[PDB]
Amino acid sequence: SKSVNVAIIGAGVVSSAFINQLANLKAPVAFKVVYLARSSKEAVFSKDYSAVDLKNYKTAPAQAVLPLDELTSYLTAAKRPTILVDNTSNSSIADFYPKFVEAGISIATPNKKAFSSDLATWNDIFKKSAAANGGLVYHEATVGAGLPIIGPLRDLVLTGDKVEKIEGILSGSLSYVFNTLSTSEKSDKKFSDVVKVAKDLGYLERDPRDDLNGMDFARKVTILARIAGFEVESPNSFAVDSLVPQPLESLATGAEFLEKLPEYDNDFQKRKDDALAENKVLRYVGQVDFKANKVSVGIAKYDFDHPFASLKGSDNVVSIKTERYPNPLIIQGAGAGAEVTAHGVLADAIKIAERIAN
Amino acid sequence: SKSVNVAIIGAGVVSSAFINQLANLKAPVAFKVVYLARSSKEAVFSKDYSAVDLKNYKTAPAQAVLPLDELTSYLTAAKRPTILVDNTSNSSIADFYPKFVEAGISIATPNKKAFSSDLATWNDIFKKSAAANGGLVYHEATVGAGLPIIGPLRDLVLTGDKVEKIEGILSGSLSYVFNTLSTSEKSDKKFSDVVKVAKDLGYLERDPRDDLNGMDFARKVTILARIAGFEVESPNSFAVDSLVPQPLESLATGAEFLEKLPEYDNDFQKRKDDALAENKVLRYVGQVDFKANKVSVGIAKYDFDHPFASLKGSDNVVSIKTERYPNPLIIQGAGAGAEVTAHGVLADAIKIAERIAN
């Protein structure tokens, strides 16, 4: 009986999986899609706020995309509780989050641009969200896709627990590289060989240096740190050890990087064998250490029986050590993928709907 | 600015841990406690619904507790959104949940008696909850205390994911004994000596057979199965391999049972030492197998690399394999304790207040 209006701004397979899960959703609160941008130029919507048929939105009559200023006024004029679903990674759309929040529009998004920018933007979003009639901001899918990381961490902070240590493998592609490369047994597999097979399997982009610089990893560490109380200024304000070797960053094309990368496999082989000599595996981790007053993203060593040393494939994992959890809360699973990301976004949008629908 | 009325029913260490966490809460929703039952005979409440001072409820003028039928009328007469916090294990208040829910009173509790009984009681509670003006029912603290298990599992079922395999260690007591009695090495430590430690170390209660029959384990498995769609009739509808030998069940004293347990110390030694030759570790797990259409609670052999083979003492763990998670979602951490249980109840209460307050 209760209902909310939904505006979907998507592009790729995450948006396609979200619409399909939304169309097949059987829930108490009803969702009515009034705006759906298929690409960066087309959008499906009616002047009378008629429901967009999610079964045939791909062939429905489309118009030019409403600018963010005009989309806000369009959604406000319906006089209904509305949720904005930002299924992109667009920095421009993320810059418009404060305007959406003031106008009473709620946001459910996997985009982490607005949450891993400057600290001022972070404080600005949630201050206007806490204000009267401010929209709700749920962003569980920004860290670990549908894994329950941000939600349980916010409940920890809200009820009075004090977090002292957050460790995590928050990149599916880089988790695959190190789990395939560094185990508890002797191995001769080369760093460049696993990078090249991870690229053609789909874990790394066609140019792997976008994933190997650890910047996307650092954005997720910034989000968890700010939720936990470690108020980081930006993902550039702490140490992020890029996996790209220094003399290979100026190369313009990916083929030149993949051609020169194998000449650094000797340096990685010795480092992996050096840690194996002291009975440890290598892992590319992000750490929020309140005790050490340190936030960092880089390679670390872990004992053979450590939970991180038994990760398989591209599984993500996060370890949350707090005052009430001397032994840390550990959550692991698939941290990426179209369906699991769309699940995290839809779960957030349902929680918002239960709170604002009428 | 917005608020709900709260009626707290409690007893011992969890109730005091919850009241302290609620007294120091800095949340956007206000909680006005209009009824606080300290013991089974004394309660603090006023004719005018005056708020109970949470820092002085112990040294306040107390009245006789209101019977359940009359407590419901007292709470509904205020015409305010109300949450009942049931910090007990009492079976009479659990039986009254349908009356609480139909009256519009929401419930947040760690008491699993209402959720681990007959299947007709389970459907009745959530049908009256789903009905118009029905109270919300949040019970995350029933399985794994404050660990995020029921929440995430409800979400993926709600968004259309198909569960196919749930495994879990759900007893801190039984997790301890099986961790310090079955490893990848080789141990002559016998079954009685491990139990004798927890016999008087607070892990096991006065009568060790209470935490060895696996019935509390079976209660939590029943809850997870019903959430995921395996509608179990009762915890006595599937196999529960009690660790208490049958000839020892007839004894009336826990000390007399423990002294004749070493008769089977060599039988478990045979069980333990043999599984090691198979490169397997013995763990006491609960399983919800949708493919085999079977629920069970008992001993099972697990590999050395399996996550269940390296648990930190009494840490609980749950594994959820679904259509979207071929590699299962795994959540582990402390599954018991007054502060972490109270946190699970408080986080649920906050989620309820976010949905009903005005």
XYZ file of C-alpha atoms in Angstrom:
716
model
C 0.000 0.000 0.000
C 2.854 2.366 0.828
C 4.767 3.789 -2.116
C 7.841 5.809 -3.085
C 9.007 7.403 -6.322
C 12.288 6.206 -7.832
C 14.678 7.936 -10.234
C 17.339 5.623 -11.680
C 20.501 7.057 -13.246
C 22.492 4.100 -14.559
C 24.690 2.953 -17.413
C 26.340 -0.471 -17.288
C 25.554 -3.982 -16.109
C 25.181 -2.853 -12.479
C 22.256 -0.669 -13.551
C 20.904 -3.493 -15.720
C 21.065 -5.978 -12.840
C 19.496 -3.406 -10.502
C 16.486 -2.750 -12.742
C 15.896 -6.483 -13.213
C 16.040 -7.217 -9.478
C 13.805 -4.186 -8.915
C 11.271 -5.376 -11.504
C 11.051 -8.832 -9.881
C 10.966 -7.433 -6.335
C 8.214 -8.755 -4.040
C 8.242 -6.418 -1.037
C 5.730 -4.611 1.202
C 6.639 -1.080 0.090
C 5.856 -0.486 -3.582
C 8.376 1.234 -5.855
C 7.268 3.498 -8.715
C 9.998 4.448 -11.191
C 9.287 7.905 -12.627
C 12.703 8.681 -14.167
C 15.170 6.282 -15.790
C 18.273 7.453 -17.664
C 19.393 4.667 -19.993
C 22.632 6.334 -21.124
C 24.337 9.707 -20.675
C 21.958 11.231 -23.257
C 18.572 9.451 -23.058
C 16.061 9.180 -20.222
C 12.560 7.700 -19.959
C 9.970 9.727 -18.043
C 6.488 11.197 -18.431
C 5.150 14.651 -17.615
C 2.416 13.119 -15.424
C 4.910 10.934 -13.491
C 3.530 7.737 -15.014
C 5.334 4.582 -13.942
C 8.190 3.583 -16.244
C 7.591 0.038 -17.482
C 10.783 -1.716 -16.402
C 10.028 -4.621 -18.750
C 10.319 -2.466 -21.892
C 12.283 0.628 -20.862
C 14.913 -0.154 -23.512
C 12.487 0.445 -26.404
C 10.285 3.033 -24.672
C 10.139 6.582 -26.075
C 13.131 8.504 -24.743
C 14.033 12.180 -24.405
C 17.156 14.167 -23.609
C 18.445 13.664 -20.072
C 17.164 16.219 -17.587
C 20.008 18.313 -16.140
C 20.548 17.760 -12.434
C 18.975 21.137 -11.631
C 15.849 20.308 -13.639
C 15.752 16.686 -12.464
C 15.607 17.895 -8.852
C 12.656 20.208 -9.515
C 10.986 17.502 -11.615
C 11.209 14.979 -8.770
C 10.137 17.545 -6.159
C 6.983 18.544 -8.063
C 5.567 15.010 -7.756
C 4.959 15.622 -4.014
C 5.952 12.045 -3.147
C 8.823 10.539 -1.141
C 11.519 9.898 -3.736
C 14.723 7.855 -3.822
C 17.595 8.655 -6.181
C 19.531 5.584 -7.337
C 22.945 6.639 -8.683
C 24.232 3.486 -10.405
C 27.205 5.306 -11.977
C 30.662 6.420 -10.865
C 30.134 9.906 -12.284
C 32.011 12.618 -10.403
C 29.599 15.270 -11.709
C 26.499 13.504 -10.368
C 28.261 12.934 -7.040
C 28.970 16.674 -6.826
C 25.187 17.235 -6.822
C 24.428 15.074 -3.767
C 24.074 18.048 -1.336
C 21.408 19.604 -3.565
C 19.479 16.319 -3.700
C 19.620 15.922 0.084
C 18.262 19.396 0.869
C 15.322 18.889 -1.518
C 14.241 15.803 0.461
C 15.523 13.298 -2.114
C 17.049 10.140 -0.645
C 20.094 8.508 -2.237
C 21.082 4.853 -2.578
C 24.290 4.472 -4.535
C 27.350 2.320 -5.187
C 29.182 5.454 -6.363
C 31.939 6.371 -3.906
C 33.028 9.664 -5.504
C 31.116 11.839 -3.022
C 32.198 9.774 0.007
C 35.920 9.634 -0.872
C 36.453 13.273 -1.859
C 37.501 15.988 0.575
C 36.452 15.683 4.211
C 34.328 18.835 3.883
C 32.085 17.214 1.262
C 31.654 14.156 3.501
C 30.606 16.317 6.456
C 28.352 18.372 4.173
C 26.330 15.403 2.873
C 25.439 13.870 6.234
C 24.910 17.187 8.033
C 22.208 18.072 5.503
C 20.962 14.482 5.715
C 20.588 14.797 9.493
C 18.759 18.119 9.113
C 14.972 18.219 9.138
C 13.417 16.901 5.906
C 16.893 16.073 4.606
C 17.149 13.044 2.370
C 18.594 9.769 3.600
C 21.972 8.606 2.275
C 22.602 4.842 2.142
C 25.811 3.684 0.453
C 26.448 0.076 1.504
C 27.499 -0.952 -2.013
C 30.459 1.470 -2.022
C 32.586 -0.923 0.084
C 32.485 -4.658 -0.577
C 29.438 -4.482 -2.906
C 26.541 -6.278 -1.150
C 28.682 -7.524 1.736
C 27.373 -6.230 5.110
C 30.287 -3.946 6.019
C 29.134 -0.314 6.188
C 25.797 -1.096 7.847
C 27.154 -3.184 10.731
C 30.024 -0.715 11.167
C 27.660 2.248 11.571
C 25.588 0.361 14.150
C 28.827 -0.264 16.059
C 29.675 3.448 16.187
C 26.099 4.530 16.911
C 25.611 2.293 19.966
C 28.869 3.436 21.598
C 31.494 0.875 20.570
C 35.011 2.160 19.855
C 36.842 0.710 16.850
C 40.623 0.383 17.125
C 41.685 -1.636 14.054
C 40.210 -2.184 10.582
C 42.019 -4.518 8.179
C 40.665 -5.550 4.811
C 41.116 -6.846 1.281
C 38.605 -4.565 -0.449
C 39.625 -5.051 -4.107
C 38.434 -8.150 -5.935
C 40.967 -7.863 -8.753
C 43.949 -7.344 -6.438
C 42.723 -10.093 -4.110
C 42.800 -12.493 -7.064
C 46.344 -11.445 -7.987
C 47.815 -12.082 -4.538
C 45.780 -15.199 -3.710
C 46.948 -16.803 -6.968
C 50.529 -15.602 -6.440
C 51.317 -15.999 -2.721
C 50.260 -19.098 -0.774
C 51.855 -21.155 2.005
C 53.661 -23.379 -0.532
C 56.684 -22.743 -2.721
C 55.758 -21.196 -6.060
C 57.463 -19.830 -9.173
C 54.449 -17.995 -10.625
C 55.469 -14.546 -11.842
C 53.735 -11.285 -10.966
C 53.450 -10.225 -14.613
C 51.997 -13.603 -15.618
C 49.158 -13.432 -13.086
C 48.474 -9.788 -13.978
C 48.215 -10.715 -17.660
C 45.865 -13.635 -17.015
C 43.793 -11.530 -14.602
C 43.420 -8.920 -17.351
C 42.099 -11.346 -19.976
C 39.803 -13.049 -17.455
C 38.183 -9.683 -16.665
C 39.531 -8.920 -13.181
C 41.844 -6.115 -14.339
C 40.997 -3.483 -16.924
C 42.554 -3.549 -20.389
C 45.144 -1.208 -18.851
C 45.869 -2.802 -15.442
C 47.630 0.277 -14.019
C 44.233 1.785 -13.173
C 43.676 -1.097 -10.731
C 47.309 -1.586 -9.677
C 47.789 1.951 -8.324
C 45.479 1.075 -5.414
C 43.521 4.330 -5.665
C 40.128 2.611 -5.859
C 41.208 0.519 -2.867
C 42.192 3.748 -1.091
C 38.758 5.298 -1.672
C 37.073 2.407 0.150
C 39.568 2.634 3.020
C 38.739 6.344 3.279
C 35.022 5.551 3.581
C 35.477 2.978 6.351
C 37.896 5.278 8.185
C 35.465 8.210 8.202
C 32.589 6.035 9.417
C 34.841 4.681 12.173
C 35.941 8.135 13.390
C 39.342 8.429 11.648
C 38.594 11.658 9.763
C 40.841 11.339 6.710
C 41.127 14.385 4.454
C 41.260 12.497 1.141
C 42.522 9.224 -0.380
C 45.719 11.136 -1.245
C 46.353 12.068 2.408
C 47.883 8.713 3.400
C 50.338 6.134 2.103
C 49.086 4.116 -0.884
C 51.837 1.845 -2.232
C 51.122 1.453 -5.939
C 51.782 -1.990 -7.385
C 52.870 -0.303 -10.636
C 56.684 -0.051 -10.528
C 57.895 3.550 -10.583
C 59.792 3.534 -13.942
C 56.650 2.291 -15.733
C 54.099 4.990 -14.864
C 54.976 7.384 -17.709
C 54.191 4.777 -20.384
C 51.124 5.979 -22.264
C 49.812 2.658 -23.615
C 49.022 -0.563 -21.789
C 50.941 -2.784 -24.208
C 54.186 -1.040 -23.243
C 53.425 -1.573 -19.549
C 52.660 -5.277 -20.007
C 55.845 -5.614 -22.079
C 58.190 -4.084 -19.483
C 56.472 -5.414 -16.345
C 58.111 -8.904 -16.532
C 61.554 -7.360 -15.937
C 60.443 -6.639 -12.345
C 59.234 -10.174 -11.569
C 62.647 -10.932 -10.051
C 62.093 -8.235 -7.420
C 58.673 -9.653 -6.523
C 59.877 -13.269 -6.500
C 62.557 -12.457 -3.922
C 60.097 -10.511 -1.760
C 57.559 -13.348 -1.844
C 60.277 -15.910 -1.093
C 61.628 -13.690 1.693
C 58.255 -13.678 3.458
C 57.769 -17.389 2.749
C 61.131 -17.978 4.450
C 59.653 -16.485 7.639
C 56.393 -18.443 7.137
C 54.147 -15.632 5.889
C 52.139 -14.782 2.782
C 51.911 -11.450 0.975
C 48.615 -9.556 0.828
C 47.657 -6.140 -0.539
C 45.690 -4.756 2.405
C 44.197 -1.519 3.660
C 44.534 -0.662 7.339
C 42.806 1.871 9.588
C 44.893 1.695 12.773
C 43.610 3.963 15.538
C 46.299 2.641 17.896
C 49.135 3.422 15.475
C 47.294 6.568 14.280
C 47.857 5.273 10.757
C 45.834 4.753 7.585
C 47.673 2.866 4.858
C 47.168 0.736 1.749
C 49.944 -1.611 0.696
C 51.524 -5.038 0.852
C 51.620 -6.700 4.274
C 52.721 -10.076 5.630
C 50.351 -12.524 7.322
C 50.925 -15.846 9.066
C 49.799 -19.054 7.381
C 46.906 -19.567 9.827
C 45.743 -15.943 9.651
C 42.236 -15.500 8.177
C 43.678 -13.476 5.281
C 46.069 -16.299 4.317
C 43.136 -18.596 3.445
C 41.292 -16.290 1.038
C 40.340 -18.038 -2.202
C 40.136 -16.320 -5.568
C 38.760 -12.782 -5.598
C 37.055 -12.894 -2.191
C 37.001 -9.680 -0.196
C 37.434 -9.654 3.576
C 37.330 -7.044 6.336
C 38.446 -7.387 9.963
C 36.913 -4.975 12.483
C 38.586 -4.990 15.908
C 36.759 -2.855 18.484
C 36.474 -2.398 22.241
C 33.539 -4.827 22.452
C 35.216 -7.150 19.898
C 38.738 -7.924 21.169
C 38.712 -10.751 18.663
C 37.621 -8.888 15.531
C 34.395 -9.165 13.598
C 35.350 -10.727 10.256
C 33.196 -10.549 7.117
C 34.285 -12.076 3.812
C 32.792 -12.928 0.451
C 32.435 -11.660 -3.087
C 33.107 -7.918 -2.986
C 32.370 -7.222 -6.660
C 30.085 -8.317 -9.472
C 27.003 -6.926 -11.173
C 24.412 -8.919 -9.221
C 25.993 -8.645 -5.765
C 26.487 -4.895 -6.248
C 22.885 -4.430 -7.391
C 21.791 -6.410 -4.323
C 23.591 -3.981 -2.018
C 21.980 -0.996 -3.735
C 18.489 -2.519 -3.735
C 18.783 -3.539 -0.075
C 19.658 0.060 0.814
C 16.781 1.440 -1.268
C 14.354 -0.909 0.497
C 15.560 0.262 3.921
C 15.036 3.876 2.829
C 11.577 3.046 1.473
C 10.498 1.429 4.751
C 11.357 4.721 6.493
C 9.926 7.345 4.098
C 7.046 5.654 2.244
C 3.455 6.694 2.915
C 12.454 15.792 17.679
C 10.760 12.484 16.867
C 10.397 9.824 19.536
C 8.950 6.446 20.480
C 7.825 5.005 23.787
C 9.821 2.035 25.077
C 8.903 -0.738 27.521
C 11.920 -2.698 28.775
C 11.533 -6.185 30.255
C 14.767 -7.617 31.603
C 16.599 -9.412 34.400
C 20.361 -9.828 34.628
C 23.576 -8.808 32.912
C 22.200 -8.311 29.378
C 19.401 -6.025 30.582
C 21.797 -3.816 32.554
C 24.214 -3.712 29.614
C 21.322 -2.677 27.359
C 20.042 0.054 29.689
C 23.543 1.513 30.001
C 23.979 1.559 26.219
C 20.534 3.132 25.832
C 21.185 5.704 28.571
C 24.304 6.991 26.773
C 22.762 6.875 23.286
C 23.280 9.903 21.018
C 20.820 9.059 18.235
C 18.552 11.293 16.117
C 15.459 9.463 17.419
C 14.529 10.018 21.065
C 13.711 7.034 23.291
C 11.267 7.706 26.139
C 11.203 4.665 28.434
C 7.688 4.634 29.916
C 7.921 1.162 31.502
C 10.959 -0.567 33.023
C 10.586 -3.925 34.791
C 13.669 -4.421 36.964
C 12.755 -7.824 38.429
C 9.938 -10.321 37.911
C 7.925 -8.449 40.573
C 8.901 -4.741 40.443
C 8.394 -2.264 37.603
C 8.873 1.493 37.224
C 6.117 3.365 35.391
C 3.921 6.414 35.905
C 0.247 7.193 35.378
C 1.214 10.113 33.106
C 3.819 8.188 31.049
C 6.674 10.111 32.662
C 10.085 9.054 31.387
C 12.074 6.656 33.560
C 15.481 7.988 34.601
C 17.864 5.404 33.146
C 20.698 6.439 35.483
C 18.531 6.021 38.604
C 15.976 3.307 37.769
C 17.500 1.034 40.423
C 16.900 3.544 43.230
C 13.402 4.610 42.141
C 9.960 3.918 43.657
C 8.769 0.644 42.151
C 5.271 -0.788 41.750
C 3.981 -4.260 40.997
C 4.628 -5.461 37.460
C 1.734 -5.092 35.053
C 0.343 -8.380 33.695
C 0.964 -8.850 29.991
C -2.634 -8.168 28.930
C -2.674 -4.984 31.034
C 0.820 -3.844 30.049
C -0.429 -3.910 26.451
C -3.430 -1.725 27.295
C -1.208 0.649 29.282
C 1.152 1.071 26.325
C -1.530 1.436 23.642
C -3.480 3.985 25.704
C -0.598 6.447 25.261
C -1.286 6.659 21.494
C 2.445 6.721 20.788
C 4.654 4.476 18.631
C 5.998 1.905 21.069
C 8.837 -0.627 21.110
C 8.980 -3.514 23.572
C 12.498 -4.632 24.513
C 12.369 -8.206 25.849
C 15.790 -8.822 27.424
C 14.656 -12.122 28.970
C 14.520 -15.817 28.148
C 11.039 -16.153 29.650
C 8.625 -18.364 27.726
C 5.435 -16.582 28.841
C 6.395 -13.220 27.331
C 7.493 -14.986 24.137
C 4.046 -16.601 23.912
C 2.540 -13.094 24.085
C 4.350 -11.679 21.021
C 1.280 -12.126 18.738
C -0.797 -10.076 21.185
C 1.923 -7.410 21.348
C 2.267 -7.297 17.560
C -1.449 -7.142 16.743
C -1.793 -4.208 19.160
C 0.780 -2.269 17.124
C 3.663 -2.714 19.580
C 7.028 -3.357 17.945
C 9.435 -5.910 19.413
C 13.236 -6.043 19.635
C 14.589 -8.998 21.568
C 17.374 -11.586 21.903
C 14.793 -14.156 23.094
C 14.568 -16.959 20.532
C 11.747 -18.900 22.223
C 9.098 -17.291 20.011
C 11.181 -17.918 16.876
C 12.351 -21.472 17.692
C 8.973 -23.026 18.541
C 6.356 -24.557 16.256
C 6.118 -23.278 12.691
C 2.561 -22.031 13.294
C 3.813 -19.566 15.921
C 6.473 -18.277 13.510
C 3.940 -17.590 10.751
C 1.478 -16.032 13.206
C 3.986 -13.461 14.483
C 5.155 -12.304 11.050
C 1.642 -12.359 9.573
C 0.328 -10.006 12.257
C 3.511 -7.975 11.771
C 2.930 -7.754 8.016
C -0.717 -6.782 8.530
C -1.817 -3.156 8.692
C -0.697 -1.300 11.849
C 1.150 -4.403 13.045
C 4.253 -4.029 15.158
C 7.715 -4.639 13.764
C 9.677 -7.691 14.922
C 13.484 -7.438 14.929
C 15.457 -10.306 16.473
C 19.057 -10.067 15.243
C 20.438 -10.849 18.708
C 18.821 -14.316 18.690
C 21.450 -15.764 16.313
C 25.077 -14.842 16.942
C 24.272 -11.990 19.370
C 25.425 -8.729 17.716
C 26.947 -10.438 14.679
C 25.204 -9.273 11.455
C 23.648 -12.600 10.435
C 19.842 -12.373 10.419
C 19.829 -8.907 8.847
C 21.973 -9.722 5.807
C 20.223 -13.083 5.394
C 16.801 -11.416 5.388
C 18.013 -8.875 2.822
C 19.267 -11.344 0.218
C 16.089 -13.406 0.566
C 14.120 -10.177 0.124
C 15.951 -9.153 -3.075
C 15.401 -12.559 -4.692
C 18.584 -14.496 -3.917
C 18.243 -18.269 -3.541
C 19.908 -19.845 -0.504
C 21.264 -23.363 -1.001
C 23.643 -24.106 1.908
C 24.017 -22.627 5.403
C 26.771 -23.922 7.691
C 27.643 -22.555 11.097
C 29.243 -22.821 14.523
C 26.640 -21.127 16.719
C 27.783 -21.990 20.271
C 30.720 -20.226 21.870
C 30.810 -23.075 24.382
C 30.884 -25.883 21.817
C 33.209 -23.910 19.533
C 35.788 -23.752 22.328
C 35.887 -27.473 23.141
C 36.157 -28.520 19.492
C 38.902 -25.968 18.781
C 41.094 -27.067 21.723
C 40.437 -30.769 21.021
C 40.744 -31.223 17.228
C 43.616 -29.602 15.332
C 45.898 -30.416 12.394
C 48.633 -31.688 14.746
C 48.162 -34.708 17.029
C 46.680 -34.581 20.530
C 46.179 -37.000 23.411
C 44.086 -34.410 25.272
C 40.871 -36.266 26.038
C 37.245 -35.200 25.843
C 36.650 -34.930 29.598
C 39.618 -32.668 30.392
C 38.445 -30.129 27.811
C 34.901 -30.196 29.200
C 36.195 -30.036 32.784
C 37.832 -26.690 31.981
C 34.616 -25.161 30.634
C 32.668 -27.058 33.322
C 33.662 -24.386 35.865
C 35.053 -21.609 33.646
C 31.712 -19.951 32.867
C 31.621 -21.389 29.341
C 29.368 -24.294 30.341
C 26.595 -23.769 32.881
C 26.080 -25.636 36.163
C 24.873 -28.767 34.362
C 27.178 -29.347 31.359
C 24.526 -31.440 29.584
C 22.494 -28.248 29.080
C 25.072 -26.931 26.592
C 26.053 -30.373 25.241
C 22.698 -31.660 23.937
C 22.783 -29.120 21.091
C 19.220 -27.903 21.634
C 20.163 -24.225 21.938
C 22.268 -24.819 18.826
C 19.219 -26.351 17.127
C 17.111 -23.332 18.109
C 19.431 -20.951 16.249
C 19.628 -23.254 13.216
C 15.821 -23.361 13.110
C 15.718 -19.557 12.944
C 18.223 -19.317 10.078
C 16.459 -22.100 8.167
C 13.051 -20.421 8.447
C 14.475 -17.065 7.314
C 16.010 -18.611 4.187
C 12.884 -20.592 3.238
C 13.500 -23.999 4.864
C 10.301 -24.030 6.906
C 11.276 -26.318 9.787
C 8.436 -27.541 11.995
C 10.451 -27.398 15.240
C 14.014 -27.920 16.541
C 12.917 -31.528 17.210
C 11.966 -32.172 13.560
C 15.528 -32.813 12.332
C 18.577 -34.712 13.534
C 20.369 -33.218 16.551
C 23.357 -35.357 17.580
C 23.534 -34.755 21.318
C 27.062 -34.984 22.708
C 25.666 -36.554 25.905
C 25.852 -40.370 25.726
C 22.455 -42.009 26.142
C 23.283 -44.058 29.297
C 24.551 -40.817 30.881
C 21.340 -38.862 30.216
C 19.484 -40.796 32.930
C 21.704 -39.405 35.701
C 20.307 -36.482 37.691
C 23.575 -34.743 38.666
C 25.958 -32.982 36.302
C 28.908 -33.993 38.472
C 27.889 -37.661 38.328
C 27.590 -37.448 34.534
C 31.016 -35.837 34.124
C 32.727 -38.555 36.175
C 31.324 -41.352 33.977
C 31.980 -39.398 30.775
C 35.615 -40.693 30.605
C 34.071 -44.062 29.701
C 33.542 -42.480 26.271
C 36.772 -40.448 26.393
C 38.469 -43.212 24.407
C 35.492 -43.405 22.033
C 35.816 -39.719 21.160
C 39.581 -40.276 21.085
C 38.898 -42.931 18.449
C 36.632 -40.469 16.627
C 39.213 -37.680 16.890
C 42.399 -39.598 16.070
C 40.823 -41.372 13.086
C 39.516 -38.199 11.429
C 43.070 -36.840 11.633
C 44.362 -39.668 9.425
C 41.810 -38.477 6.839
C 43.315 -34.959 7.195
C 40.051 -33.802 8.774
C 39.162 -31.739 11.838
C 36.084 -32.474 13.949
C 33.615 -29.602 14.357
C 30.127 -29.457 15.876
C 28.105 -27.647 13.214
C 24.529 -26.978 12.170
C 23.646 -27.413 8.508
C 20.768 -26.236 6.320
C 21.164 -28.147 3.038
C 18.505 -27.188 0.493
C 19.789 -29.576 -2.190
C 19.598 -32.557 0.174
C 16.469 -31.074 1.832
C 17.911 -31.807 5.274
C 18.676 -29.884 8.460
C 21.094 -31.348 10.985
C 23.119 -30.497 14.087
C 26.098 -32.634 15.026
C 29.717 -33.535 14.405
C 31.217 -33.167 10.931
C 34.671 -33.545 9.396
C 36.238 -30.424 7.875
C 39.459 -29.867 5.960
C 42.553 -28.116 7.305
C 42.134 -25.188 4.887
C 38.417 -24.805 5.631
C 37.624 -21.594 7.571
C 36.140 -23.678 10.402
C 39.579 -25.220 11.052
C 41.076 -22.011 12.548
C 38.566 -20.406 14.919
C 39.716 -18.007 17.645
C 38.629 -19.839 20.781
C 34.872 -19.383 21.191
C 34.227 -17.370 18.016
C 30.999 -18.158 16.199
C 30.912 -18.423 12.408
C 28.185 -18.717 9.772
C 28.557 -19.518 6.067
C 25.797 -18.663 3.582
C 26.086 -20.097 0.065
C 23.552 -18.690 -2.406
C 22.932 -18.338 -6.133
C 24.657 -14.937 -6.096
C 27.384 -16.166 -3.691
C 28.843 -19.392 -5.120
C 31.709 -18.651 -2.771
C 29.701 -18.254 0.436
C 29.251 -15.165 2.550
C 31.138 -15.873 5.787
C 30.636 -13.907 9.011
C 32.524 -14.731 12.202
C 33.173 -13.163 15.574
C 31.911 -13.235 19.138
C 28.473 -14.858 19.285
C 27.746 -14.278 22.985
C 28.352 -11.763 25.746
C 26.258 -9.152 27.532
C 27.669 -6.091 25.755
C 27.544 -7.565 22.244
C 24.061 -9.010 22.806
C 22.840 -5.653 24.131
C 24.353 -3.960 21.073
C 22.378 -6.284 18.808
C 19.161 -5.416 20.631
C 19.909 -1.679 20.619
C 20.764 -1.574 16.907
C 17.476 -3.347 16.152
C 15.609 -0.903 18.400
C 17.178 2.016 16.527
C 16.145 0.483 13.198
C 12.588 0.079 14.493
C 12.465 3.649 15.810
C 13.684 4.935 12.437
C 10.571 3.377 10.868
C 7.786 4.121 13.384
C 8.740 7.300 15.276
C 6.882 10.587 14.861
